[PDB]
């Protein structure tokens, strides 16, 4: 592998798309590697980590309970609802909805939770309240994945998303238990977690949320480190590439390979 920056460049030229990337020390917030870190990218499903952050802040404040059962109707469901479509009769707890959103990328679960936090405008207000003045959610699932060229809606930057994920996981803005829960939901990702582990060297920690949208948009926010520890936040977004899903996945994996190969840095 080339050095990470060189691999990222190669990825842009092979994908004919824009890559944005940041590697950040989880403990200190040190930015180690940055590429287009201040450019906008569609969040896609990665927004669901922030969403569950807002939910947990409500729980901490006594305005919400993870146990609270939410009942919903079929008319409420949107495209890709693998868990929520199974519980029309019996409902799902707020905590179950969070797990379905982060671990199983359930879109209707995400919308149900969005309802509880004041919708896209409420989640955006929450971002401002934790000092993220860049990330914005404007739409619900699934329109938020539209990824129109140049459209600022539903976007973040690698730098903002990394800083925000660090704030949610470690800054004591959330309670100890809530920080632990948000981390655990990312540890439990079923969409990409088990696949990533299958290709990581022994000893490497992974927790993640992945996202996918239109026009090539792909992304991952992750915690990664050797010695079974979450040492770094890695945020990678791709946009405006015509490439196959498989090659987008491979290119993201290649940037990861470069990070691992050149870790001691
Ligand atoms: O010397 C370091 C290591 O080099 C190789 O490991 C390879 C591994 O065999 C390959 O499968 C992976 O591909 C990359 C897999 C990454 C998967 C996605 C990563 C995510 C996580 C963070 C967010 C972005 C993407 O590269 C590493 C590093 O070369 C050797 O196989 C391994 O024995 C050795 O310990």
Phi, psi for residue 233 in degrees, rounded to 5: -85, 130
Lookup: tokens for 62 = 């006594």
What is the distance, to the nearest Å, from the Cα of residue 180 to the centroid of all Cα atoms in its chain? 16
Q: Is the CB of 256 under 6 A from ligand 1?
A: yes
Burial 67-85 (b: 16+ CB within 10 A, else e): eeebebeeeebbebbebbe
Q: How far is CA 34 from CA 68, 123, 235, 236, in A?
A: 41, 26, 10, 10
Angle at 186 between CA 47 and CA 52, to 5 degrees: 45
Resolution as reported, in Å: 1.5
Q: State residue 129 phi and psi, 5-degree precision.
A: -65, -30
- Bridge-partner residues for 20, per DSSP? 237
Cβ density class 223-262: b for 16+ within 10 Å, e for less = bbbbeeebbbbbbbbbbbbebeeebbbebbebbbbbbeeb
Pull the structure tokens for residue 60. 């901490």
Beta bridge partners of 201: none
Polymer length in residues for the chain:
265
Residue with tokens 């290119």: 251
The encoded tokens of residue 184 equal: 């655990």
Q: Which residues pair with 41 in a beta bridge?
A: 156
The answer for 154, left when phi > 0, alpha when psi is -120 to 50, beta otherwise, is left
When computed from its CA atoms, the radius of gyration of the chain, rounded to whole angstroms, is 17
In the chain the domains, ranked by start, together with CATH numbers, are: 1-265 (3.40.710.10)
How distant, in Å, are the alpha carbons of 118, 204, 227, 243 from that of 133?
18, 33, 34, 32
**Pocket test residue of 199, 218, 229, 238 for ligand 1, highest count of atoms within 8 A of CB:** 199
How far apart CA 117 and CA 194 sit, in angstroms, is 30
Q: How was this structure determined?
A: X-ray
Looking up tokens 């993640």 gives 208
User: How far, in Å, is the centroid of ligand 1 from the Cα of 260?
Assistant: 6
Contact in structure between 195 and 256 (CB atoms under 8 Å): no
8 A C-beta contact, residue 171 and residue 108: no
The 3-state secondary structure of the chain, one letter per residue: CCCHHHHHHHHHHHHCCEEEEEEEECCCCCEEEEECCCCCEECHHHHHHHHHHHHHHHHHCCCCCCCCEECCCHHHCCCCCCCHHHHCCCCEEHHHHHHHHHHHCCHHHHHHHHHHCCHHHHHHHHHHHCCCCCCCCCCCCCHHHCCCCCCCCCEECHHHHHHHHHHHHHCCCCCHHHHHHHHHHHHCCCCCHHHHHHHCCCCCEEEEEEEECCCCCEEEEEEEECCCCCCEEEEEEEECCCCCHHHHHHHHHHHHHHHHHCCCC
Which pair of structure tokens corresponds to residue 30? 């040190």
Nearest atom in ligand 1 to 203's CA = 35
Measured from the Cβ of residue 65, the count of other Cβ atoms closer than 10 Å reads 12
From ligand 1's centre to the CA of 11, what distance in Å? 16
The answer to whether 136 and 121 are in contact (CB under 8 A) is: no
Angle at 31 between CA 125 and CA 102, to 5 degrees: 50
Distance CA 102, CA 221 (A): 11
């Amino acid at each position: 592998s080339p050095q990470p920056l060189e691999q990222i460049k190669l990825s842009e030229s092979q994908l004919s798309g824009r890559v944005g990337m940041i590697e950040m020390d989880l403990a200190s917030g040190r930015t180690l590697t940055a590429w287009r870190a201040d450019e906008r990218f569609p969040m896609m499903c990665t927004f669901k980590v922030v969403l569950c952050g807002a939910v947990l802040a409500r729980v901490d404040a006594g305005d919400e309970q993870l146990e609270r059962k939410i009942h919903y109707r079929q008319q409420d469901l949107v495209d890709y609802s693998p868990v929520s479509e199974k519980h029309l009769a019996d409902g799902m707890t707020v905590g179950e909805l969070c797990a379905a959103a982060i671990t199983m990328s359930d879109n209707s679960a995400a919308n149900l939770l969005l309802a509880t936090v004041g919708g896209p405008a409420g989640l955006t207000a929450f971002l401002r309240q934790i000092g993220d003045n860049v990330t914005r959610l404007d739409r619900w699932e699934t329109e938020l994945n539209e990824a129109l060229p140049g459209d600022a809606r539903d976007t973040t930057t690698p730098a903002s998303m990394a800083a925000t994920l660090r704030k949610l996981l470690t800054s004591q803005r959330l309670s100890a238990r809530s920080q632990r829960q948000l981390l655990q939901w990312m540890v439990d990702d079923r969409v990409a977690g088990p696949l990533i582990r299958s290709v990581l060297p022994a000893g490497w920690f992974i927790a993640d949320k992945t996202g996918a949208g239109e026009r090539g948009a792909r992304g991952i926010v992750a915690l990664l480190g050797p010695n079974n520890k979450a040492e770094r936040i890695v945020v990678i977004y791709l946009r405006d590439t015509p490439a196959s899903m498989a090659e987008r996945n491979q290119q993201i994996a290649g940037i990861g390979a470069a990070l691992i190969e050149h870790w001691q840095r």
